[PDB]
Design a protein around this ligand. Structure first.
Ligand SMILES: Cc1cccc(O)c1NC(=O)c1ccncc1F
Length: 435
């Protein structure tokens, strides 16, 4: 498993012990063989759970998720998937790891897809070994995998809006429920409906994840309302999962704008991960999984795979060679390897727009490829009238860095910069020259 040119997919069922049992065994064997090793966690929450499983072993934590005492002689590094991809893109030296271990290797965020591409290409080249740990590898068609204890699976209509009647089963429950919603906005309406009925609700999303997830451990709750981010190793002490079976899909229209299409069906892998939150305790059988729709391969044509290609085109591998996507997910995008390769100065702008600007990959690429410099925000105001960003059904307005009030109307429109209140507030700060 640890030999050069080998890529292993450890596909044990959810809760089988990949992180708490198998990962430390692998790390001990890698240290015995003096293999320079990287361990990739999807989120800071998973990184903290990994430190608990690896405690005592000499691991260098390159994350603020944990607070440990290092010796300086560690040959095993632990960081998030995004940090690995960010460091590859930046003019920072990244060691050429002998062993590459990716936990929750099903993560479909662009930086995770790019990390799999870079790693698998190095393995194909005969330069490294890799282990991708996931219950749902790319291409899985089983939404109902094995579990530690039996699960009651029920197809039922699940609310996507506030309700006044017809869903008594939702509130008549006395346990703890994890409910997967298609978006932050949809979660706000369901959470408000449950709060008015006397329930204690915690909401989770990408931006608020580490902070709000702590509340699931620090206080008593009845419902957790979450987006797809909780498919990546987030663990709960719950007895039911309510799953809309829906997600939003970023889609590039006419190569010129990004829209959030849907809500549409989740993939079989996402459905199995959502369901996999329960049935984890062998002593507590009969955890419930209520699902409100079917599965479909909605990852085909999804912007994240095109965005992973933009990132891989700008990562040095060897001379002019460019890393390919991991083979089981390489057909999700019709992109040409190297088509997004930028020249030195535009590449630096592209990286800064993502790292400091916090812009989506696609949008960062349009601005950098147009030859615009990082601090030049004229593009946020000179787009076509149909690119006007709306706030409360009226054009959103910002004071520019020049002191002038202007309508927010970006030259390139990406729906992710204004999908919720928090996102639009961050984009207005960017358009104003505040970061
Ligand atoms: C070693 C390293 C290299 C580069 C970036 C990093 O973020 C770290 N980690 C720490 O400084 C660190 C984190 C957590 N606990 C102790 C620690 F020293």
């Amino acid at each position: 498993m640890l030999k050069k040119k080998q890529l292993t997919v450890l596909d044990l069922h959810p809760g089988a012990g990949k992180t708490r049992r198998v990962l430390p065994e692998i790390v001990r064997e890698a240290i015995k063989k003096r293999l320079r090793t990287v361990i990739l966690a999807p989120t800071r929450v998973v990184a903290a759970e990994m430190e608990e499983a690896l405690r005592g072993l000499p691991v260098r934590y390159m994350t603020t998720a944990v607070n440990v005492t290092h010796s300086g002689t560690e040959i095993v590094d632990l960081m998030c998937h995004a940090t690995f991809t960010s460091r590859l893109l930046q003019p920072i030296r990244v060691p050429n790891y002998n062993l590459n271990i990716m936990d929750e290797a099903h993560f479909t965020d662009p930086s995770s897809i790019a990390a799999r591409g870079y790693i698998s290409t190095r393995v194909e080249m005969g330069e490294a070994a890799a282990i991708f740990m996931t219950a749902t590898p790319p291409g899985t068609r089983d939404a109902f995998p094995d579990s530690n204890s039996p699960i009651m699976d029920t197809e039922v209509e699940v609310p996507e809006r506030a309700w006044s009647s017809g869903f008594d089963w939702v509130t008549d429950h006395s346990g703890k429920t994890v409910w997967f919603v298609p978006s932050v906005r949809n979660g706000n309406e369901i959470a408000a409906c449950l709060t008015k009925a006397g329930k204690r609700v915690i909401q989770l999303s990408r931006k608020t994840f580490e902070t709000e997830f702590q509340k699931t451990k620090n206080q008593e709750w009845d419902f957790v309302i979450t987006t797809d981010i909780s498919e990546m190793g987030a663990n709960f002490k719950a007895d039911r999962v309510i799953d809309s079976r829906r997600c939003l899909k970023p889609v590039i229209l006419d190569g010129e704008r990004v829209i959030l299409a849907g809500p549409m069906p989740v993939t079989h892998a996402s459905a199995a991960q959502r369901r996999g939150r329960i049935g984890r305790n062998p002593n507590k059988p009969g955890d419930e999984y209520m699902y409100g729709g079917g599965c479909a391969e909605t990852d085909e044509g999804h912007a994240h795979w095109l965005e992973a290609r933009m990132l891989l085109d700008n990562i040095y591998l060897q001379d002019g060679l460019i890393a390919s996507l991991y083979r089981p997910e390489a057909d999700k995008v019709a992109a040409i390897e190297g088509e997004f390769k930028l020249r030195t100065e535009q590449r630096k702008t592209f990286v800064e727009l993502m790292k400091r600007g916090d812009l989506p990959v696609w949008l960062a690429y349009q601005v950098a490829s147009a030859g615009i410099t990082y601090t030049d925000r004229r593009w946020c105001f000179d787009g076509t009238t149909n690119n006007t960003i709306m706030e409360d059904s009226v054009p959103a307005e910002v004071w520019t860095k020049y002191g002038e009030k202007r309508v927010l109307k970006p030259r390139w429109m990406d729906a992710r910069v204004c999908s919720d209140h928090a996102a639009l507030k961050s984009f207005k700060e960017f358009a104003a020259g505040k970061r």
